[PDB]
Amino acid sequence: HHWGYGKHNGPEHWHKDFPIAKGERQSPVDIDTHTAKYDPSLKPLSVSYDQATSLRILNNGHAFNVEFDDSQDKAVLKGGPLDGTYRLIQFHFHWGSLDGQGSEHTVDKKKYAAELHLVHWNTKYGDFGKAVQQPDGLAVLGIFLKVGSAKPGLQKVVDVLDSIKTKGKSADFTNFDPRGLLPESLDYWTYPGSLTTPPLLECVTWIVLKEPISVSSEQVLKFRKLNFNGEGEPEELMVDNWRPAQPLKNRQIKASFK
Ligand SMILES: [Zn+2]
């Protein structure tokens, strides 16, 4: 029926409705650190989020998205392996039912408790909907979360989750600064891949940061309280909303560091 993360509609079944699921440039992947090529021609990333305007937080039934005003160049990513400017449209997370799983990308097969994705679209395409149809349409920053100390900048998000508990609920969410979600270092790995949920389009330049951020146990515990279902439907906790690692195929992972 419609895709999700259960036993009957889970990632193993997606190919039946989205044949691109078995494509040549599918994400996520395992990052083999000893095989990644250091590329000294990669520039440092440029993150300009000082003019970011968050607007709303929504439970879409598969994750929660915080959405930003992308009608102008307010929060952009450039540099790194990118050509052109990419505007932040939304961020969301992937997490697990236990601390030992939850991330989509893995490092030398190590899984993290969660993974943050900051989604940006290439301005040359005029809108998000046009950008997903292009090989260089999106740039996604992936950030791993490990359980340790609390991340102060994530608490505003944690606190509003009670109000978007079930699918379709949304809440006003203004004045949130995504700078509070970045690690100290911007060292990264990069490769060409896709969206990790249907429609699985192969339009993404992935930028995965080497340094994880820490969250407390209680912070991630609040994520696990969300629901996949709509209000008044039987309760299914929103956990394990992560796609397993896909074959690298003909692709090289490049590192911005050695
Ligand atoms: Zn994602």
Handedness of CA 144, 148, 149, 150 (dihedral sign): positive
Rounded to an integer, what distance in angstroms lies between the CA atom of residue 207 and that of residue 164?
29
CB 164 within 8 A of CB 59: yes
DSSP state of 100: T
Rounded to an integer, what distance in angstroms lies between the CA atom of residue 205 and that of residue 117?
12
The amino acid sitting at 110 is K
Catalytic residue (choose from 13, 34, 62, 105):
62
Check the annotation: does 8 bind a ligand: no
Rounded to an integer, what distance in angstroms lies between the CA atom of residue 250 and that of residue 86?
26
Residues in the chain: 258
Chain-centroid distance, C-alpha 141: 7
62: annotated active-site residue: yes
39 C-alpha to ligand 1 centroid (Å): 26
CB 192 within 8 A of CB 140: no
Secondary structure of residue 38 in the 3-state scheme: strand
Rounded to an integer, what distance in angstroms lies between the CA atom of residue 157 and that of residue 173?
9
- Between the alpha carbon of residue 73 and those of residues 23, 69, 70, the distances in Å are 32, 9, 7
Both tokens assigned to 50: 């000082």
141 C-alpha to ligand 1 centroid (Å): 10
Residue 77: name the closest of 207, 203, 184 by CA: 207
The amino acid sitting at 11 is P
Domains of the chain: 1-258 (3.10.200.10)
Greatest alpha-carbon span in the chain: 54
Check the annotation: does 94 bind a ligand: yes
Rounded to an integer, what distance in angstroms lies between the CA atom of residue 23 and that of residue 228?
27
Chain-centroid distance, C-alpha 78: 17
158 C-alpha to ligand 1 centroid (Å): 18
CB 30 within 8 A of CB 245: yes
**Beta-strand (E) ranges in the chain?**
30-31, 37-38, 45-48, 54-59, 64-68, 76-79, 86-95, 106-107, 114-122, 138-147, 170-172, 188-193, 204-209, 213-215, 254-255
Residues near 173 by beta carbon (within 8 Å), at least 6 away in sequence: 54, 55, 56, 57, 66, 67, 160
Radius of gyration of the chain (CA): 17
116 C-alpha to ligand 1 centroid (Å): 7
